[PDB]
Amino acid sequence: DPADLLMEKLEQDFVSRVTECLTTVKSVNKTDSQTLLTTFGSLEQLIAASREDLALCPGLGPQKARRLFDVLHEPFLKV
Amino acid sequence: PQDFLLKMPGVNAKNCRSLMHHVKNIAELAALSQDELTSILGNAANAKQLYDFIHTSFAEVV
Numbered sequence: 589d590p591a592d593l594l595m596e597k598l599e600q601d602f603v604s605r606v607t608e609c610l611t612t613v614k615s616v617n618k619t620d621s622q623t624l625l626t627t628f629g630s631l632e633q634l635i636a637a638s639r640e641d642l643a644l645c646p647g648l649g650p651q652k653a654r655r656l657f658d659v660l661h662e663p664f665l666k667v
Numbered sequence: 668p669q670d671f672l673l674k675m676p677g678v679n680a681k682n683c684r685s686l687m688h689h690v691k692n693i694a695e696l697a698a699l700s701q702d703e704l705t706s707i708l709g710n711a712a713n714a715k716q717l718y719d720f721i722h723t724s725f726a727e728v729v
């Protein structure tokens with residue numbers, strides 16, 4: 589197709605970067621992450637989300653839902 | 668949770684420090700404007716990259 593092909597490429601690239609972030613979380617998947625992203629639409633909605641909303645993403649523990657809510661909400665600074 | 672932060676676009680070893688200082692956690696990252704990110708990173712285009720990563724949405728497919 590014309591450069592729908594380019595839209596596809598830029599789309600995959602972006603998404604695959606989102607996966608680089610999320611798969612940082614304690615074994616939370618490439619799959620988890622693509623689903624996550626497409627359900628929530630943007631990382632902004634994804635982190636504005638409660639552990640409850642996260643668990644509504646079809647698939648995904650409430651286990652995986654906790655781990656991720658934490659990484660996102662736990663503060664950068666501790667000691 | 669800094670492992671997360673660093674793989675974020677327009678974030679590098681230098682500014683991971685500075686940014687861990689003015690924002691509580693990742694969640695709060697959602698909460699900032701582009702200008703507030705620029706000032707916190709001192710790089711206007713780094714701020715573009717990270718702000719865009721965060722605010723880009725799928726919600727189309729008509």
Ligand SMILES: [Hg+2]
Nearest residue numbers: 623624645648
């Ligand atoms: Hg999911």
